[PDB]
Design a protein around this ligand. Structure first.
Ligand SMILES: N[C@](CC1c2ccccc2Oc2ccccc21)(C(=O)O)[C@H]1C[C@@H]1C(=O)O
Ligand SMILES: N[C@](CC1c2ccccc2Oc2ccccc21)(C(=O)O)[C@H]1C[C@@H]1C(=O)O
Ligand SMILES: *[C@@H]1O[C@H](CO)[C@@H](O)[C@H](O)[C@H]1NC(C)=O
Ligand SMILES: *[C@@H]1O[C@H](CO)[C@@H](O)[C@H](O)[C@H]1NC(C)=O
Lengths: 763, 751
């Protein structure tokens, strides 16, 4: 028989407390729910009694109660809630405000019914994402956080421990499917992605649980799992994990909470588990007022008799139902008891604010508010209550507020599963999540820095700052690191930047400033001998000219050409000087100038030879000197003009195992020297041809023999060295060494030939 | 505020906008003659026929229960509680609800009825919100929603090849939701919108004039898609009258075929396409409706009020202000018209009757005169199973064409049939004429269009480019494409930039048409090199004559060696042939260099004056050097020049690209060395021959030196091509041969 708890008052508040259990199909309303129906109903009754008496909240207006039952059903809840609007559509009593159905389906149906009829609803216990949608339920409010705030808490706690690679376990139906999507979407911003988004059905086999545990075990680098399951589903999952000897840092939703029955029978495989539970505190006044009730005291509650008959096995015919003390009996307060009184006080505050803002003349309820409207109340007063929670502890601070979506503030208490030194296994509180995350890291022994914490990142990156090549789509959570090639540089963290193949990047991997080279690497092989020979050649010229000066005042020297001897001596000194200074730092006008002078010096020797054999072959002397001087000047002018026009100096090997060459402007001198070499070769060839037909008359102490020897020696040396110069041109180091030797060799041959006349002069 | 009620086994609910929406103290005032009263009798007429006919529910009598809504959300919502109060004036259970003419009214009723498992079918609600079955589990319509109107016009643009269009809308559910549907359909069919905008309810001409002006700045779109109600439709036409232009209007059910839209502005609305719901008139209903009088129609309480308002007369308690109604007064066709949605109301009534008959037949096998256990009704079984799957012909069909079949889709929406109305001038008088239909595929009659096929407006963006001469680039919008010209010597690109084939390729109309079409040393020798060749041929003839006389004389070998070099140089010009070859080019370069070397070295013996063996040995050394190049990998097959920068259609290769580069340098060095030695030797010698011979020998040396020196800048600046390369080589070799022969043959001829 349907019954209603009714109280007479100016303003009446509805009720849909599920006192009766749903039961089986045969019994629509069988067993009486005491923890969730009777306790919360008595909490509402106590809140109404307290608000009635207190002269500070709606001081004059008295509040009534119209409490019904839902029987944990939706159609029955709708049928009972139809009585709420049976008087407000236009003895039945007008009902304003209801306190929800204490479920998801019941609250959804009640809100859908009351949205059209303009009746506000404040559900004391309802956590669903559908009710947060204002398009379908714009008149629904709740004092409990929705199911996506615990997702925020779990994502934040995962971020705090630097865990980014996680595996999610879902559940069939509501609270197991919606939570996964919200958690994933929220973890997208926090750079956290799923690994195995496995789901568990309602009737899911034990061997199937073992297979699912093996599926979780398939990923090796996944030591953390987030659980969205109901209590018994979590119990069976932990049992399967214990049977398969699988251990993870379990992270769980409100389903696990701090219930001992969930972990009971599976101890050992749940150590280090992290769980979050809704924050609540016991109320001493309600506990004293509930234990101050026996069946013969209260009449207002029609279901109190059924609760008494259910709780104690006595009977109201004649039995222990009158000797049962009920005092000092094992009793526990339901977690969601303070929410009921908070909702009642929020409704009382909204009504008081409405009365104050609409009836400011007298404390009595004015008649101007007779057409009660839920729209104005919900928009102005219900959604703008900011008051301290009644019966709150003095040390703590609690404020009841509603958001723009009608949901209450979120506060979750994080729990950890320990190993007591002397006690048994039990839970504890290590932190809370009201507005900002906070935990005591040192409190947890398992999740401590010293007891082998598990990052479970799966993408560990121990690579150096200059050895990162993380170029792979993979997953946005993390990526693998590879050292860059030595030829490249790590200028950019994402991709190695191969700014230059030659130079090796520095430690910072950003100094793409090239790699130089030196041409001053003196050694025993290429510097000890080559430098001495060039210096000796210049010194030998000084010794040679000394004999000539002493022999200048001699009849023998008069016959020989004084100008030719001086020109030959100057050319030998000039070529030797260029070779001696060739070992120097190149610049714009150092290396280029030195090589240009060497070509002129070599041509001077060829010109001196030409003017020394024409006279012998013929047999005006000034004509030969002028012609030779013009040829030397013409060759120098042609070379000098080419320097400005077609003598660009640049060269460096970068790709194949090499750095920038040690050169400034004498890099392309091979092309420039081709013209000078061709002129020198032609002059040498012409001199040799003339010398072949010369030396007919052996005059001047057989000086023609010396001239012929030079032609047969200088041409042979130049011809032999020609393939060497072309071959050595490939490598700069080889070319420099060969060039110095060739210049010194040419000067030595000329100096050696002139040694014989010096010996005759001395002797 | 009353209620039609008739006892029966089953009863159907009713909600009609009998009274128009009012203001002030009165919730609703004047009665609605067309929307409310006319549709009221249509359901009553339909329900009466069901009882009379024995082919549909023979033993089951269908009741009636109609409650006024006054076109108000709050009033209609509170009037639906009667249909659910009896499911827990004696309350009686309601089998179903047939009512709701306004989208807002139906939304409120659907929300309440879906919770109590009561199927409801609406006869005019075309809102797209009701199509969301998640929010409204139990709702069905006999009319198509606003989605299909956008779909119908989406196919119209595709049929007429219209892509660049302008869309307008109006504030409210109709304009906002309708315009959104068109965008979704246009995206799949590739239609892009232009200057899309919406108008408000301010009813100010300044805002409307601004909207019209906003169309002027975009002349590429001369077709406008309309999603606005009939209330402001006349205002836009009036606004468009000022500063008139040319536009084509593609309107929706708001405009329709109503003549009140156009009033003195029939010039800007010319050639407008409008969509109107298909609704055949009901012949039977006209006879039934005209036979209603207040004397016997006691069931309808609103009939008396309608009679007073329509005729402006009072029947009871008549005052002096209103005349008493005359006797023998009946409604006639002179001032009576059929409502556009009468057939939809009749179909809605038949939907439950067929559904109830099917459920009665199955759940009560072999039963009649009421049913068994059809006391409580299950919404899920009746609606989701025995109501959505229905296929019966429309009752009272004037033609029985069977095209009109009453059925519900997956979402419960009725079949969507529309009529395409075209606005045209006939006989100087503007009129509306249907020119097609839209059941599921758009069907149009081209011949039905009058005085509008002369222009056939297109309004197309980004007329397609020709990839042959210009390429395509991505503009700001993907739908439109711009023409970009690329360089002509690269092959066609389908959508991207024209990729370059390279050098020497001439693309054609084909996409990959570009291919190697190299020229073979383009024949400019006939114009350029023929002259030097003919001169060389004349020199060869002179050389042959010189050889002939020398051969005849027997000591009257040095001359033969010199003559051989001249003859070899003669064929050097003919050696260069248009046909490419990797061996002829190398041989020609070697032969030309060898011929110059032996000829130059011939005078060396004369200056020095056993000698024959030395000359032969020296000549062999020059030949060995020439063939030394061919020994290495210097020689290679000829290849086209990489003249990418030059815009040359064809590439001509004749020098093999490795011969002229190396042979010219080698030949110049060899020629310079011998020339310098000969010049020096000539001066040194004190004329060891005849006076004429000494002068001729000396003069010859200068001629070769001058020619070689003059030709040296030519080699550097030759710029080897089909003409200059051949002409320069032929000219240079001709001078050398003539100089040698000139200084040798002349002394012999004189002596
Ligand atoms: N709001 C609760 C939360 C509930 C729940 C709680 C914990 C674990 C599983 C679980 O299943 C779902 C699924 C969807 C939505 C809510 C829940 C309810 O039962 O609906 C709970 C206040 C109600 C009461 O305890 O009276
Ligand atoms: N079904 C209609 C369609 C109506 C409508 C029709 C054409 C142009 C604008 C327009 O405004 C909207 C806006 C949203 C939804 C429906 C409409 C209704 O009013 O609900 C129409 C049968 C009702 C009647 O008046 O007879
Ligand atoms: C997480 O990483 C941060 C790096 O910014 C570090 O400071 C913090 O100590 C880490 N937390 C751990 C290892 O628990
Ligand atoms: C539209 O274009 C198609 C080709 O895509 C053509 O076949 C058809 O005739 C056109 N319709 C017109 C121009 O009305």
């Amino acid at each position: 028989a349907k019954k209603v708890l009714t109280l007479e008052g100016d303003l009446v508040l509805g009720g849909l407390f599920p006192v009766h259990q749903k039961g089986g199909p045969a019994e629509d309303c069988g067993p009486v729910n005491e923890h969730r129906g009777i306790q919360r109903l008595e909490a509402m009754l106590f809140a109404l009694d307290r608000i009635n008496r207190d002269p500070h909240l709606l001081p004059g207006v008295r509040l009534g109660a119209h409490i019904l039952d839902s029987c944990s059903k939706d159609t029955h809840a709708l049928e009972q809630a139809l009585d709420f609007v049976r008087a407000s559509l236009s003895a039945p009593t007008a009902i304003t405000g209801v306190i929800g159905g204490s479920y998801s389906d019941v609250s959804i149906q009640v809100a859908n019914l009351l949205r059209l009829f303009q009746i506000p609803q404040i559900s004391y216990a309802s956590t669903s994402a559908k009710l947060s949608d204002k398009s379908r339920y714009d008149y629904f409010a709740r004092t409990v956080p929705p199911d996506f705030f615990q997702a925020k808490a779990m994502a934040e706690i995962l971020r705090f421990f630097n865990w980014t690679y996680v595996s999610t376990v879902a559940s069939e139906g509501d609270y197991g499917e919606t939570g996964i999507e919200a958690f994933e979407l929220e973890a997208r911003a926090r750079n956290i992605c799923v690994a195995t988004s496995e789901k568990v059905g309602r009737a899911m086999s034990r061997a199937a649980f073992e297979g699912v545990v093996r599926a979780l075990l398939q990923k090796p680098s996944a030591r953390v799992a987030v659980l969205f399951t109901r209590s018994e589903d979590a119990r069976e999952l932990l049992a399967a994990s214990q049977r398969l000897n699988a251990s993870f840092t379990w992270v769980a939703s409100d389903g696990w909470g701090a219930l001992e029955s969930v972990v009971a029978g599976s101890e050992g495989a749940a150590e280090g588990a992290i769980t979050i539970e809704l924050a609540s505190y016991p109320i001493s006044d309600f506990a004293s007022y509930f234990q101050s009730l026996d069946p013969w005291n209260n009449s207002r509650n029609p279901w109190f008799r059924e609760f008494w008959e259910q709780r104690f096995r006595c009977s109201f015919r004649q039995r222990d139902c009158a000797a049962h003390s009920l005092r000092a009996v094992p009793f526990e307060q339901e977690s969601k008891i303070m929410f009921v009184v908070n909702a009642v006080y929020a409704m009382a505050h909204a009504l008081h604010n409405m009365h104050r803002a609409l009836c400011p003349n007298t404390t009595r309820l004015c008649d101007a508010m007779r057409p009660v409207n839920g729209r104005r109340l919900y928009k102005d007063f219900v959604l703008n209550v900011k008051f301290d929670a009644p019966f709150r502890p003095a040390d703590t601070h609690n404020e009841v507020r509603f958001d723009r979506f009608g949901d209450g503030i979120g506060r979750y208490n994080i729990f950890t599963y320990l190993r007591a030194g002397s006690g048994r296994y039990r839970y504890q509180k290590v932190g809370y999540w009201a507005e900002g995350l906070t935990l005591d890291t040192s409190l947890i022994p398992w999740a401590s820095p010293s007891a082998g914490p598990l990052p479970a990142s799966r993408c560990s990156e121990p690579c150096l700052q200059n050895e990162v090549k993380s170029v792979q789509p993979g997953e946005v959570c993390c990526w693998l690191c590879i050292p860059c090639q030595p030829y490249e540089y790590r200028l950019d963290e994402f991709t190695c930047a191969d700014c230059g193949l030659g130079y090796w990047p520095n430690a910072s991997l950003t100094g793409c400033f090239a790699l130089p080279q030196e041409y001053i690497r003196w050694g025993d092989a290429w510097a000890v001998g080559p430098v001495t020979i060039a210096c000796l050649g210049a010194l030998a010229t000084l010794f040679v000219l000394g004999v000539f000066v002493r022999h200048n005042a001699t009849p023998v020297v008069k016959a020989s050409g004084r100008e030719l001897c001086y020109i030959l001596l100057g050319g030998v000194f000039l070529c030797y000087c260029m070779t001696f200074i060739f070992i120097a730092k190149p610049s714009t006008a150092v290396c280029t100038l030195r090589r240009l002078g060497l070509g002129t010096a070599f041509s001077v020797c060829y010109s001196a030879l030409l003017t020394k054999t024409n006279r012998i072959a013929r047999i005006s002397p000034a004509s030969q000197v002028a012609i030779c001087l013009a040829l030397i000047s013409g060759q120098l002018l042609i070379v000098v003009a080419w320097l400005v026009v077609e003598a660009p100096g640049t060269g460096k090997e970068t790709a194949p195992e090499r750095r920038e060459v040690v050169t400034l402007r004498c890099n392309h001198r091979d092309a420039s020297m081709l013209g000078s070499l061709a002129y020198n070769v032609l002059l040498i060839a012409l001199c040799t041809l003339y010398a072949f037909k010369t030396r007919k008359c052996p005059e001047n102490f057989n000086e023609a023999k010396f001239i012929g020897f030079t032609m047969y020696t200088t041409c042979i040396i130049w011809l032999a060295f020609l393939p060497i110069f072309y071959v050595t041109s490939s490598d700069y180091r080889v070319q420099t060494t060969t060039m110095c030797v060739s210049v010194s060799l040419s000067g030595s041959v000329v100096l050696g030939c002139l040694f014989a006349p010096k010996l005759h002069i001395i002797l | 505020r009353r209620e039609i009620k008739i006892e029966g086994d089953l009863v159907l609910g009713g909600l009609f906008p009998i009274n128009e929406k009012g203001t002030g103290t009165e919730e609703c005032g004047r009665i609605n003659e067309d929307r409310g009263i006319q549709r009221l009798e249509a359901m009553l007429f339909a329900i009466d026929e069901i009882n009379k006919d024995d082919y549909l529910l023979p033993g089951v009598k269908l009741g009636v229960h109609i409650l006024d809504t006054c076109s108000r959300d709050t009033y209609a919502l509170e009037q639906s509680l009667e249909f659910v109060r009896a499911s827990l004036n004696i309350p009686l259970l309601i089998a179903g609800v047939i009512g709701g003419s306004y989208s807002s009214v139906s939304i409120q009723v659907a929300n309440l009825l879906r919770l109590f498992q009561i199927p409801q079918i609406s006869y005019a609600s075309t809102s797209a919100k009701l199509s969301d079955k998640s929010r409204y589990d139990y709702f069905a319509r006999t009319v198509p929603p606003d989605f299909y109107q956008a779909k119908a016009m989406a196919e119209i643009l595709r049929f007429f090849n219209w892509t660049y269009v302008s869309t307008v809308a109006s504030e409210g559910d109709y304009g906002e939701t309708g315009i959104e549907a068109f965008e979704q359909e246009a995206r799949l069919r590739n239609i892009c919108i232009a200057t899309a905008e919406k108008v408000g309810r301010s009813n100010i001409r300044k805002s409307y004039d601004s909207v019209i002006r906003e169309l002027l700045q975009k002349p590429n779109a001369r077709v406008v898609v309309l999603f606005m109600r009939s209330d402001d439709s006349r205002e836009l036409i009036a606004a468009a009258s000022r500063a008139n232009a040319s536009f084509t209007w593609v309107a929706s059910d708001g405009w329709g075929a109503q003549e009140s839209i156009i009033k003195g502005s029939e010039h800007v609305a010319y050639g407008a396409i409008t969509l109107e719901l298909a609704s055949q008139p009901v012949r039977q209903f006209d006879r039934y409706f005209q036979s209603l009088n207040p004397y016997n129609n006691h069931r309808n309480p609103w009939f008396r009020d309608f009679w007073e308002q329509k005729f402006q007369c009072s029947l009871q308690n008549k005052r002096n202000h209103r005349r008493v109604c005359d006797k023998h007064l009946a409604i006639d066709s002179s001032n009576y018209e059929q409502e556009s949605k009468i057939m939809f109301v009749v179909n809605a009534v038949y939907a439950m009757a067929h559904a109830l008959h099917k459920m009665q037949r199955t759940l009560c096998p072999n039963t009649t005169k009421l049913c068994d256990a059809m006391k409580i009704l299950d919404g899920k079984k009746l609606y989701k199973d025995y109501l959505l799957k229905i296929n019966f012909t429309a009752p009272f069909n004037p033609n029985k064409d069977a095209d009109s079949i009453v059925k519900f889709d997956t979402f419960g929406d009725g079949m969507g049939r529309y009529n395409v109305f075209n606005f045209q001038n006939v006989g100087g008088k503007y009129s509306y004429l249907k020119v097609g239909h839209w059941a599921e595929t758009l069907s149009l009659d081209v011949n039905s269009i009058h005085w509008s096929r002369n222009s056939v407006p297109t309004s197309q963006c980004s007329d397609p480019c020709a990839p042959n001469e210009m390429k395509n680039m991505q503009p700001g919008d993907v739908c439109c494409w711009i023409c970009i010209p690329c360089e002509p010597y690269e092959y066609l690109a389908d959508e991207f930039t024209c990729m370059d084939c390279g050098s020497g390729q001439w693309p054609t109309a084909d996409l990959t048409g570009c291919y190697d079409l190299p020229e073979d040393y383009i024949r400019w020798e006939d114009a350029w090199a023929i002259g030097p060749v003919t001169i060389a041929c004349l020199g060869f003839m002179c050389t042959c004559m010189v050889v002939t006389v020398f051969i005849k004389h027997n000591n009257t070998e040095l001359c033969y060696i010199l003559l051989f070099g001249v003859g070899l140089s003669y064929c050097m010009t003919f050696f260069f042939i248009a046909k490419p070859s990797p061996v002829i080019c190398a041989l020609r370069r070697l032969g030309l260099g060898s011929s110059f070397a032996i000829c130059y070295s011939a005078l060396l013996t004369k200056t020095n004056c056993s000698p024959s063996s030395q000359v032969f040995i020296c000549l062999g050394l020059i030949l060995v050097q020439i063939v030394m190049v061919s020994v290495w990998l210097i020689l290679e097959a000829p290849g086209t020049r990489r003249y990418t920068l030059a815009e040359k259609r064809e590439t001509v290769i004749l020098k093999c690209n490795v011969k002229d580069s190396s042979m010219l340098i080698s030949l110049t060095y060899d020629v310079i060395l011998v020339i310098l030695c000969t010049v020096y030797a000539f001066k040194t010698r004190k004329c060891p021959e005849n006076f004429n011979e000494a002068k001729f020998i000396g003069f010859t040396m200068y001629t070769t030196c001058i020619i070689w020196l003059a030709f040296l800048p030519i080699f550097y600046v030759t710029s080897s091509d089909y003409r200059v390369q051949t002409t320069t080589m032929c000219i240079s070799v001709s001078l050398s041969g003539f100089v040698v022969l000139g200084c040798l043959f002349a002394p012999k001829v004189h002596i």
